[model samples]
Target chain A: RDVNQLTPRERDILKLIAQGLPNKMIARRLDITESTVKVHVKHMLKKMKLKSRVEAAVWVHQERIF
Target chain B: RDVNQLTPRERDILKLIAQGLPNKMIARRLDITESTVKVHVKHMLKKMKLKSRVEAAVWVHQERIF
Candidate 1:
């Protein structure tokens, strides 16, 4: 699967991740649990084929996904 | 003292850093030494008053400094 496979919510998570927000902050902003944010981040990383949060962020900038 | 205080090359380094490039990769891309890249990164972080590379990257994205 490619980046296009990312769901809207996943994309939103990616944007926040690129902004360097931690799962705690993201969870607070979205009113979701920290574990849920972690799940989203893991799923997004799998879809994006990225290794780390920093890499995911860089990927977003490089691909202009946001 | 603001983002404007960053030299043009420092700005370039920041962009690549925000892209999550490692110091080695950044050096290779800019045709400079890794130590030089490190120095520039240090300077940029000081100017931005950011604590970590991740924070710096997030700052760039949030500020749209690139």
Candidate 2:
């Protein structure tokens, strides 16, 4: 589903989180500031309708969408 | 919107992802096994329809919804 419209960074972050990384850690690892990371996170969730990472996290695991 | 109904674990995981820690890191930090972390991650992503974690992470940061 994310084959399009996802920047490399967004895909990276998404994969990291699916693996189970926190935002702060994701930001640091990605070499991006936490603030910028915030923007990316918000866009994906708002666009996606996910209530929480656990929900999304679980989903990623279930469908093997990763 | 997440003002309520968030389990402590859910909020904790979301906050961590928002902070930017990878699942392996989150699992290690939270003392939960990686497989359990997988379960949590899958659930979070599915309920949200988030194409990926990047979306969820970005949303958490924006709106200060966390």
Candidate 3:
């Protein structure tokens, strides 16, 4: 999927997720609640049509977007 | 790290690991035991000098290797 479809904040979260940061860490880094991070990841997975964070991380690598 | 140092089998295993397949699934696909997959992963990580499979997977794309 084209990453341009995502919001900038979504892209930021996806970039970190691709780096293997857990949701909790992402939340801490982004200054958001863990639940918010989860929500962002859930949306990211839906947009990318992937089943897991692992797939999303690999996808980011495959696309070389981060 | 130089992936050229890896055997063909190790490269194949690393490629699959990069795609985020769990040890059991990777073993099933490769027709090897899960323990054998673990051993391969351990060796691959040592060669790549990466802390996690996630890093290896991202590295594969960062390097544009399969």
The candidate scoring highest on lDDT is 3
- Residues B1-66 of candidate 1 have per-residue lDDT tens digits of 368899988898988878888889999999999999999989988988886677788777767777
Off by over 4 Å in 1: B1-16, B22-46, B61-66
TM-score of 2: 0.47
- Give candidate 3's error at residue B61 in angstroms: 1.2
- Taking all chains together, the TM-score of candidate 3 against the true structure is 0.73
> On a 0 to 100 scale, what is the lDDT of residue B4 in model 1?
88
> Which candidate, 1 or 3, would have the higher lDDT against the true structure?
3
Docking class of 1: acceptable
Best by DockQ: 3
Highest TM-score, which number?
3
Model 2 lDDT per residue over B1-66, tens place:
352455667667777776656788889999998888777777776665655566666666444575
| DockQ scores of the candidates | 0.40, 0.05, 0.55
C-alpha positional error of residue B11 in candidate 2 after TM-score superposition, expressed in Å: 1.6
Position B43, candidate 2: lDDT: 70
lDDT of each: 0.83, 0.67, 0.84
Local accuracy of candidate 3 as per-residue lDDT tens digits, B1-66: 889999888898889978978788889999999999999999898987887777777788777785
The 10-residue segment with the lowest total lDDT in model 2 chain B: B1-10
